Design a binder for this molecule. Sequence first.
Ligand code: BN6
Ligand code: ZN
Ligand code: ZN
Lengths: 16, 22, 152, 183
Amino acid sequence: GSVVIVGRIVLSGKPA
Amino acid sequence: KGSVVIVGRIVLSGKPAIIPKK
Amino acid sequence: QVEGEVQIVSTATQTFLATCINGVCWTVYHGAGTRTIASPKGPVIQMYTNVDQDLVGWPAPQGSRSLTPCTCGSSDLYLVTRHADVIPVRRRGDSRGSLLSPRPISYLKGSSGGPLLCPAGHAVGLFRAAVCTRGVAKAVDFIPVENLETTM
Amino acid sequence: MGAPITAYAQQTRGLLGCIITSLTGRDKNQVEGEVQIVSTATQTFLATCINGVCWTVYHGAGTRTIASPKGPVIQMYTNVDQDLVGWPAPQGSRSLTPCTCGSSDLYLVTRHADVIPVRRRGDSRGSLLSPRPISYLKGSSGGPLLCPAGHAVGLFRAAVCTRGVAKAVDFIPVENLETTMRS
Ligand SMILES: *[C@](O)(C(=O)NCC(=O)N[C@H](C(=O)O)c1ccccc1)[C@H](CC1CC1)NC(=O)N(CC1CC1)NC(=O)[C@@H](NC(=O)OCC(C)C)C1CCCCC1
Ligand SMILES: [Zn+2]
Ligand SMILES: [Zn+2]
């Protein structure tokens, strides 16, 4: 099996 | 002399956020 | 683009978190096991697998940025959940900490692998498991950064 | 604002845009945040907004005006001795508030938006718990020093480094900011 990344969290809340 | 210019910023107000999908 | 320190991951069986510290994407062995992490070039294997510590680590994935270890020894911790919720935790010892305001376990579910930060946002440890009494999580179990540091 | 202290940076201008704006003195750009990455034709450093005033280090801003969307803005406070200057905080910025807990555990925010622990060892000094090469700190003069709740304790001024490594830093306590306003 494989662990897949379904999302990400930016700790500083930096907007795109 | 010339003016001091804001070239960028550093934001402390931000808090953890799930980066929205593009 | 914006890079995340914490990755939200999944396996057929579950969902939890992974945290990137020192160029490695760490998570709980009870979540990942020995599975490889997916990559656009194929599965990439674990760099470290410390089954004893309930710790595993792969090379940090893309769109991620690494977190810095704590060096201030603070006891004021902050747990970031899988929903980016922050939970104030007062450290009770090497690998234990008490939630300042207890929360029902559901609120902490799926966040193991996540980070335990100090007041400077530095990694103090990695969330291992919630210690709850009757469905209310009032404490947490964690892997100190030093262990990750040692495993490297 | 409180803890954990996390910070992020955003570049808003480049070399040429900075020069034109420096000369014209008219910056129509949107401004956000509590700490502004500031520059002159000479050097770049930081300016921190505390209680509606955008403070920075005198050895960087000298007595220059700040470019704003309405032309240059003259300084509100200049204090060569305290090494302080302050302009009205730009419209859009958010201000920090002075510390009121007397915490000895401070956190210095570098121009790269890195938060680094500093143990207060006096009214205008603290030591890095984890030293760094002086270059990590270059460009950070004027940046804030915070207590665990994210309140301003002082502005970074100079780093006490030896052999090329900053082991301690000297700051301008928020008190000097008050004494500089009353006079
Ligand atoms: C801040 O003024 C500062 O960060 N300056 C901006 C800067 O460095 N800009 C350049 C640039 O624009 O070219 C830059 C280089 C690289 C990347 C980005 C920008 C500065 C903090 C420095 C220490 C990190 N302050 C000083 O330069 N000061 C001010 C003097 C009046 C006190 N001087 C020092 O900090 C020097 N130390 C010192 O004087 O120690 C005695 C006590 C007061 C502690 C150091 C300067 C760097 C080399 C070692 C000595
Ligand atoms: Zn710390
Ligand atoms: Zn305080």
